[PDB]
């Protein structure tokens, strides 16, 4: 059959509204890992097929099938005979079927957490950016078109939106926010550390006792033409111990089982390793951006002092004390308005807020 | 069954808005290679069928089927007997089933990257073309029809849109853009090099040790009537080594397996080679266009100096110093407006911007 | 099952807007050949059934089925025995299964190319007919109904649309178009040559070594009652060589296989030959029309000089010098407006353009 | 399963707009024959079942099934033994499975051609009736309701629609139409001859060597209770020659096969013969109508001279010379307006055109 | 499975607009007989099952199944032995499977014809009732609600609708209609005779040689408890002659086949006989209504002379000569307006037409 779900993918992939730069790789990460996880445990609707001997009546084949899938499997390159005891034969032991498809779902969830941390944390800070942005937005969606306001366009932002934002600041500033920028940079630290932990989980996945995977080694093998049977690891043909019961208890034998899933798993561990290390390095530089921002803060004002330089007629109020009134809170939320509404609609907003800021400072 | 997906193909094939010339062969390339890849690994919902001997009970047939698919296969033209050892029989060894259907998906993704590079890079440059184009666009969609503005049509562009664009330039020009044209031509260099690398991946695909494919050789064979068995390569009937286990370990035999997929794969490697070399040569000339543009830049102004020659009443301001004010940034974004909105609506815009450009120069 | 796709057929069959006369046989050709191709390789969801002898266990039947389909088949009229060697038996050898269903898809694509050549070429010429036609169109869709403009109807075309068209000509005429008519007639030459090449591909299809098909011979046989077995070619019952492997290598035998597809293929090669030769002869006369047009050009003006003869009040400007101003470019685009908008709405447009043409000549 | 397609049947059955009287039996003919054809080759999703002897293993049953379907079948009434040789047994030979379901599709197409001839031919004539009719139509759809125009209703047709039609005549009359009526009557001759040829194809279908079908003979048999086995023709139980291969080559035997399709085919050849002869005789009288019309032409004016007799106030212009101005072209297009818009809305149009016709004559 | 089609049943069952009294039993008749016919030949997706003896291998069971269905079957009450020869055993011979399900479809079509006769015939008469009724209808749908016209309500019908109808009469009366009432009563004669012929076809169906069916006999048996086996006719268990072929030719035997369809067929021949005789007697009285109408015609005016008796203020014009002007044509179309629009909206129309009728008489 075929399964194509457009809508549910569009829910996370689209619906929640933000343009946040490359923080939307949480949005797409959840989709990739969620779809891969839900696809693998779907078993491509036979995971494993086996050689079980002549006289089994085919209700046992459908048994030794699972009993090989559930109980572990192992591998030996072939011609070593079987070795002996339980050890030298079981030395290389490949069962990651138990982990991978579920631990991916867990991965995806742990990529979704940081957004939740940011929503709950901004609701803790007291000043909600979602409402403000969606407001000044549609203010800019209405009268951008209307020709009645252009020569007035500057004075239009003065009354209606700028009093809304500048009014929200008065309420928030009395409740648990001069700090909301700091809360944001903690959110992005959590983003980075989360990414690296996920990557490390990919590495330590499979089993650390038998190697570990990271891409340029595997591609540095395949592209040398080492396949599997001559590389000594990661096989597609696995022997399977097997146990009946009689008054002689164990009665174990070895039945080799061709193994399909191992053709997918290491075709997508070459991709998904590159893509997770990419999400890691693009998420970790975004963090140092904001520690730099939070630290220097004298060059955090370059964008605002830049917008105030266009400033038709440049009326009166001085520069510094405007930052004295706006400094802790608004200096951030402006860096948010520029990121969503665009650039030019923000400059009008921050040049209007300079005119009406008196009573507060 | 039948799978027909119109919508998801229309998402990439349509939804993101641009007319960029023959840069939309990334758009269609992703569709061709993505659909081919997703179709091949669908196995036309039997990849390979085999001759396995008389006494197997049909749970082994369904085994030696995979065990032949997963483990490699090879080919010998027939009547050579089997030769001997492991080598002369395995000399020509055909397994590209492992690579092709997945490496196509990887291809498609690597065709989608350059668009991403251009979006992220224009967001780095500071001046967003998407917003501007979509703005002056619907400005031209509203009052193109309205009869109240025609004798005023020139003066209409003066106030409303031209102040928007010409205002965006003031903001961008202070932040990391005189260069956005250079960023664009780097994007197109990446486009070309990406295309040629993809083509080279097609060539080196299959296995370089046993020939390599490029079209006029294969068609230069088929159209001479060489099929396969007499051309010595690329078969549809492949022998398959096979291994049981007993106290005598290997016990290998040879079971020839009719092989269906090889009827598709080299029907679409004749097409897809031509089509990739075409995308290559149409993408590589588009690049030299922009290096020429970026270099000479005295003949990059021919279109603007051309629009200013229609110029009703040709009021006052001289020619050169207009380019002195507009030169680095706007000279590009105009070449973008002409490409999307059409030609005639752009000439009005660039003849209006000449009138209101004073304060900035 | 049943597959009925209305929408995707309506996309090519309808969506792209033009009335171009019998150039829409590219539009319908792509549909016929694409649907036939996609239907044939669907195998009418058994291509071939065979007689394979008594003791095969039905996993071999499902093998010799393909091994007969993939490896070639041949035919002998029956009672000749088998002849001998490999030659006299294989003299008539029927395998076109490999070619036909795919080479049809290739056909369809090569019918779609010329439209692409025309779009890209008109975008090279500098003056876009699509925008202009869709503009003066909906200008004629709005105020055709409105009763306020009829006595003014002539003066209505004067201001709004005619300045748009006549303004586009000023821009184009400075960039790489006096020639757009020539580009068009090259497009139609490509149309004709493309058609004849496709037809010739039908002929040389099957195999030229064993006859070739063209309709009045086949119908000139069937309607004489020659079927197949007595006509010596084109059978529905084909013998199939077959090869096992043992220490005696070849072990070939002959197993006759009833062959279904051959009932479809030559029911639609009687139709599709007629229909391609029709598309050829209707496409090739359309070409000589435009070479005649491009050559004489004194009788290319008959339609315009005809429209200017209705001409209420026939004000002032002389005849010839109007053509001197309009000659190279507009004389074409008018022959385009007449073809899409209809006839009477074009006459108003070309009688209005005579009034406002002064400044340009 | 069940297949019900409403929309595609509604496309031809409805969408193209015309009321043309009983020329819409092309519209419905295409539907009947197309649906019958597509239903028969669907095989009622077993065409033929057979008696094949005891020891065949059921992969041969599924062979001799087709090999009987593809290779011909014959019939003998039973108890004649088998006769002998190849002739007396094969005398009556029933295979129309090869022809019927496809030749119906061909039929349907050849019913659709004449409409195409009429569209292309009217586009050759220069004056498009589709646009005019759809125009004066919605002119009559708008202000039929509006109460502001009734006492003015006559004067309403004077300005807006009548100048449109009467203006189109000026353009057409200069290009290849005084004749469009003649083109129409050639179209209807083609209609009639096409119908009779189709009917004759039904007759000569099956095989002329063994009888031929026309209804009152078959019903004149069935309703006498002659079924098949006693009527000597048209059986439901057919013997089937069959050929193996051994060192004795032919080895033919006779295996009688119950035959289902023959229960449908002559249930719908009783219907479809009546219905085609009806379409023939209703289409052939429609033709003599228009040859009469084209010939006498003094009584072709009875409808117009009839409309001019209601004529409130009957102002001035004489009768004959109005026909002198309108005679060749408009006299037809009026007989078209009466057929689509109805009758009363046409009389207003032709009584208005009498008032404004001066300048043209 | 399940098949439920609402829309296609609603097309005939609803879409064509008329209230014609009990002439809509053609509308519902077509649905009943069409659905029954299409359901029966669907075989309730096994028509007949049979006892065929021990040693048949189940590819013969699936043969003797059809060979019993196609070739006839017969019946004997049981214990008579088999009798002898071919006659006494085959005396009662039940095969109506061949006829019934198709002859029902033919029935339905022959119920649909009379509507077609009426549409074509009214289009022959020259005055189209469909347009008029649908016009004065929506005239009554608009201003019935509007409160501005009530005291004016009488004068409202005077200008707008009544001039439309009374104007159509002037055109029609000059072309082939004083007679349209006569055409209508011929249509209803055809309706009645058609109904009785259909009923007689039900009777003579099955086979007249073995009884015939009409309801009160069958129910007069079942409700006496005569079932089948003791009533001597109409069985559910039928013996089936059967023929192999050997050098002894016939080799016929008798294999009794349980027969399911016979449980449906005479459950719905009890219903459908009553329902057809009802449609007959309700359709035949509707006919004598109109012969009475057409004949006396002095009491055909009772409804109009009745409406003119309400007549506010009863202005001037006498009674009889109004009928002299309206007599042949309008006297009918009024009896049509009363049947569709209702009664009270018609009285206003016929009291308005009395006021404005002067010029015509």
Curated annotation (Swiss-Prot), chains A, B, C, D, E:
GO molecular function: gap junction channel activity; gap junction hemi-channel activity
Membrane protein topology class: Multi-pass membrane protein
Pfam families, per the entry: Innexin (PF00876)
Protein's GO biological process: monoatomic ion transmembrane transport
Key words, A-Z: Cell junction, Cell membrane, Gap junction, Ion channel, Ion transport, Membrane, Transmembrane, Transmembrane helix, Transport
Residue spans crossing the bilayer: 30-48, 103-123, 182-202, 268-288
InterPro entries linked to this entry: Innexin
Entry keyword annotation includes Transmembrane: yes
Main location: membrane
Origin: domain of life: Eukaryota
GO cellular component: gap junction; plasma membrane
Location in the cell: Cell membrane; Cell junction, Gap junction
Function: Structural component of the gap junctions.
Family: Belongs to the pannexin family.
Protein name according to UniProt: Innexin-6
Species: Caenorhabditis elegans
Organism taxonomic ancestry: Eukaryota, Metazoa, Ecdysozoa, Nematoda, Chromadorea
Underlying gene: inx-6
């Amino acid at each position: 059959a075929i399964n194509s779900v457009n809508a549910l993918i569009s829910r996370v992939f689209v619906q929640p509204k933000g343009d946040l730069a490359d923080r939307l790789n949480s949005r797409v990460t959840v989709v990739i890992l969620a779809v891969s996880s839900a696809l693998l445990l779907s078993s491509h609707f036979d995971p494993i097929t086996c050689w079980t001997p002549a006289q089994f009546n085919a209700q046992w084949v459908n048994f030794v099938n699972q009993y090989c899938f559930v109980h572990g499997t192992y591998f030996v390159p072939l011609d070593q005979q079987l070795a002996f005891e339980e050890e030298e034969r079981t030395k290389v032991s490949i069962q990651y079927y138990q982990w991978v498809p579920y631990v991916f779902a867990l991965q995806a969830f742990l990529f979704y957490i940081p957004r939740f941390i940011w929503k709950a944390m901004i609701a803790y800070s007291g000043y909600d950016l979602a409402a403000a942005v969606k407001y000044v937005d549609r203010f800019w969606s209405e009268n951008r078109d209307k020709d009645d306001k252009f020569k007035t366009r500057l004075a239009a932002f003065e009354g209606r939106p700028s009093v809304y934002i500048w009014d929200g600041i008065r309420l928030a500033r009395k409740k648990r926010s001069r700090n909301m920028a700091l809360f944001y940079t903690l959110s992005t630290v959590w983003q980075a550390v989360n990414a690296w932990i996920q990557f490390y989980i990919l590495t330590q996945l499979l089993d650390s006792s038998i190697y570990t995977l990271w891409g340029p080694s595997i591609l540095g093998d395949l592209l040398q033409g080492n396949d599997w049977q001559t590389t000594g690891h990661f096989p597609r043909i696995v022997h399977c111990d097997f146990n009946r019961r009689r008054p002689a208890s164990v009665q174990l034998d070895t039945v080799l089982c061709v193994l399909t899933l191992n053709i997918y798993y290491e075709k997508l561990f070459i991709f998904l390793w590159f893509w997770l290390v990419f999400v890691a390095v693009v998420s970790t530089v975004n963090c140092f951006k904001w520690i730099y921002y939070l630290c220097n803060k004298t060059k955090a004002q370059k964008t605002i002092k830049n917008y105030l330089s266009t400033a038709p007629i440049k009326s009166t109020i001085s520069d510094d004390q405007f930052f004295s009134a706006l400094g802790e809170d608004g200096l951030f939320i402006m860096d948010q308005m520029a990121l969503n509404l665009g650039d030019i609609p923000a400059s009008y907003l921050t040049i209007s807020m300079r005119n009406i800021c008196q009573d507060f400072i």
